[model samples]
Target chain A: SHKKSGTYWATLITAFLKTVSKVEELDCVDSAVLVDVSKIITLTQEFRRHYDSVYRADYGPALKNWKRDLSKLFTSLFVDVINSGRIVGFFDVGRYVCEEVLCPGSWTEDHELLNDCMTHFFIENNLMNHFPLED
Target chain B: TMENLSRRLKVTEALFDIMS
Candidate 1:
């Protein structure tokens, strides 16, 4: 169960970031995506402090919001892909990440979440079977 | 590249399907 959760989250974290970058490049990407991404960026200030020990501050819902908003982001992408004849949009990124995706709730260690995200994101490269973040 | 993207779309649609 532990290993499976790790794998699910690895994809979720990695692909969530993937879509953020995708949202920026594609004008057709909607405002809801921008809002979700904005919230993650909003919370990262505290996440940065928590991730960095020098500022031993009480953490906030930054991580929780990240996970929730990401799912919401996917919800929109999923619906859009279903609705439109859109063959080649943000779904590619989600699909790529989902190939190895996982998830969770009621958080754990602060740094692990962010650290895990970075670790997973690092694994992605252009050569990987998924469409590498196109321009 | 259209064929490649089309293949990706199919994969993505399938991915969404199994997700539920």
Candidate 2:
């Protein structure tokens, strides 16, 4: 009998699924900064390092494809954000998590590096202009 | 806004498919 040891992946994937679902349901995809980059980065890496073979055993094939497809998806999403000159809510956030934080060796468990990565992400993406100082 | 919503809905549905 398999013990089903994919807790980390299960939770991580479920969290993302819920977020994406809510963004669609609420039609809040164009909003800015609905979630935190730091929290996302932390949890993502933590889960990725967890040794749970159950996920790879059952949903492994689809999970592999999901990563590749998600990468492609965000690549196109960045174009949309760039054209709109906005974060595009979860799309940009998700992209940042996948590209900058989640990728191997890009950002480890350093708050300072995380800060820089967050700053650099906005700067490189030119998303600063959309932020209003005040009304 | 609607376009963004629709596109997000598509992505969300795709995510659901993969997760399910």
Candidate 3:
């Protein structure tokens, strides 16, 4: 129940962040790409809004843990990754973090979701034909 | 990477459980 919901949220957030990092580096932009990024930002906001509502209803002002502690960690991570001061972009840093530091970090067991994210990454970078499909 | 991912996810849920 909660575990599954947590997994789903983690997966979606991670995947969306991955796309954002990749898309931000593109030298080109099209309507579809722009729209996709906008949609991602909108969706992330919706999640934040949902979390806020839940926070108010469930914990009230008595507890500021998730908003205070967890959010601090998340924001620090976001800032650290964004301001890493290097030639590599955000997603590149994130990729290295996931592969090297995390050593097999991923948020879900859903193969389709993972593949879809990678596909979007490649497509946005204009390498979609590299793994051309065959009949 | 599945192990790392699952671990992180569980940790997140655990933190939420503890905090909220």
Using DockQ as the measure, the top candidate is 2
My TM-score estimates for the predictions, one after another, are 0.24, 0.27, 0.25
Docking class of 3: incorrect
* Backbone clash count for every predicted candidate, in the order shown: 3, 0, 2
Better of 2 and 3 by TM-score: 2
Tens-digit lDDT string for candidate 3 (B1-20): 32232233333333333442
Model 3 Cα lDDT, one tens digit per residue, A1-135: 112233333343355444444423334544444444455454334433434444433222211222223223333333322221110122232333333333143443432343344444433433322212212
Candidate 2 — which residues are off by over 4 angstroms? A1-75, A83-111, B1-20
Q: What is the Å distance of residue B14 in model 1 from its true position?
A: 40
DockQ of 2: 0.06
What is the overall TM-score of model 2 with all chains considered together?
Answer: 0.27
Model 1 per-residue lDDT at A104: 32
Better of 1 and 3 by TM-score: 3
Residue pairs clashing in model 1 are: A8-A101, A8-A102, A9-A102
Best by lDDT: 2
Error of 1 at B10 (Å): 40
